[PDB]
Amino acid sequence: EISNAASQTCEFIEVTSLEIDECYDFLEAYGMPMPVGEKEEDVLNKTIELSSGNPATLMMFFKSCEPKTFEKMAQLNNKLESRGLVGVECITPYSYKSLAMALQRCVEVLSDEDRSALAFAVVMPPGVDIPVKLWSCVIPVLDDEVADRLKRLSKRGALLSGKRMPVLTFKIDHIIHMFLKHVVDAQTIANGISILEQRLLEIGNNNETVIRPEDFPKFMQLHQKFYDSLKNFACC
Amino acid sequence: EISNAASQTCEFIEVTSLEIDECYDFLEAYGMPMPVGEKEEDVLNKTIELSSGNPATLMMFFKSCEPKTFEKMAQLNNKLESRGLVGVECITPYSYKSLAMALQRCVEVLSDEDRSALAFAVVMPPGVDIPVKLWSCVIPVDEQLDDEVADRLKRLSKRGALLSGKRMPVLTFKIDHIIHMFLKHVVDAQTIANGISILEQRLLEIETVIRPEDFPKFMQLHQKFYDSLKNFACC
Amino acid sequence: MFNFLG
Amino acid sequence: PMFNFL
């Protein structure tokens, strides 16, 4: 948004997250052995999904992959889920020990209220497209205002992910998630989880390439699997 | 337990909670209009359940029933769950405005760990008889045999009569309603939600009737009295 | 933990 | 203490 400072021929070029093929290429480039078995190409889609297309964390991955095996690579695939970005923070061409140290700052500059919204998007599902109202449950203040915050939030460090149609929906990636995991107040995780089961049942009392229908928001139980893990995290 | 200090002729008389009938007698005793409609004897069995047979809070209750109507009596019955004992705290023959000032003391003297166990018995269902393992889930301890929970829940009933032990059919304790709603508006709003979730973990592994071991995995039977705490700790 | 012990 | 430093 700093470009709004300039009244001019402002032109823009966005560096997206490294697409899955470009990720293969980055691995190939420095001598990392490419898959065969299905749960190895899957292990690598696990890494690429986790490091939601991210140069720096990919490099930290290689640098921390010691023997080079897919096996010890999956070791890391665990470490990333049960230790967040701090599991793979390493000496890298990046000025930063870990992408989390960077995102820290990225999180500091934020409008106090946006700092709140972001702080809350933990208790969501990562790598999932979800409606504005479905977000209105955890986000502070017609709740379109949520969209204004979530837009500012992707605009200011590319922390979210907007997708206009089929329906105005947003989405949170994985690096940007495990940032928030081991970083937001351990309580506030469980508080956001509960505040969600609350408005969900609230909506309950009013009565793949497919978005979640308004007949079915009432059960976020679809993501119970990951939701159960988040719950296993906060309250211990 | 102070009696274990004395080596001598020791004899005991336990002042139990006012039985459902004696409360009627007590009501009649201080000019209380006796029910007619069904949802009036129900209003008063609601009071007797809520104030789990307790002279003092019952007296505070009359003293606070102002117009005398069963109506304002159900008003108080409401006032008690969503404002706690403070909805009926009054100038009473009791040295205390409300029973919370008493249990205060009863809770300070308590073994630190017992203070903890007690602090957690909030996240239960009140006026329900429930197993030791069903307690082992929420109650703290510094392996595989949890009788230590029972030892604590016993000290806890012996020492201010905060719980309620009941040997058979199966070794079970129980928390009453006043002794619960004490803890409601008094323990850390967090520790409640933490006990509810910390319960929802063990909650899966692999009427005048106790809950069977084929069915512990779903405490959802008591969903009502759990939806009220989840609603509570989110305010 | 215990709102002034009660 | 929501978040960390910050």
Swiss-Prot record, chain A:
It is found in: Mitochondrion; Cytoplasm, Perinuclear region. Disruption phenotype: Mutants exhibit a block in almost all programmed cell deaths that normally occur during development. RNAi-mediated knockdown causes a defect in egg laying in a small proportion of animals. Also causes a moderate increase in CEP neuron survival in response to high Al(3+) levels. In an ain-1 mutant background, enhances the proportion of animals arrested at the larval stage, with egg-laying defects and with a ruptured vulva. ATP binds at residues 92, 94. Component of the egl-1, ced-9, ced-4 and ced-3 apoptotic signaling cascade required for the initiation of programmed cell death in cells fated to die during embryonic and postembryonic development. During oogenesis, required for germline apoptosis downstream of ced-9 and upstream of ced-3 but independently of egl-1. May regulate germline apoptosis in response to DNA damage, probably downstream of let-60/ras and mpk-1 pathway. Regulates CEP neuron apoptosis in response to high Al(3+) levels. Associates as an asymmetric homodimer with ced-9. Only one ced-4 molecule within the dimer interacts directly with ced-9. Upon release from ced-9, forms a multimer, known as the apoptosome, and interacts with ced-3; the interaction results in ced-3 autoproteolytic cleavage and activation. Multiple oligomeric states of the apoptosome are observed including hexamers, heptamers and octamers. The hexamers likely represent a pre-mature state of the apoptosome and may contribute to the regulation of ced-3 activation. This is Cell death protein 4.
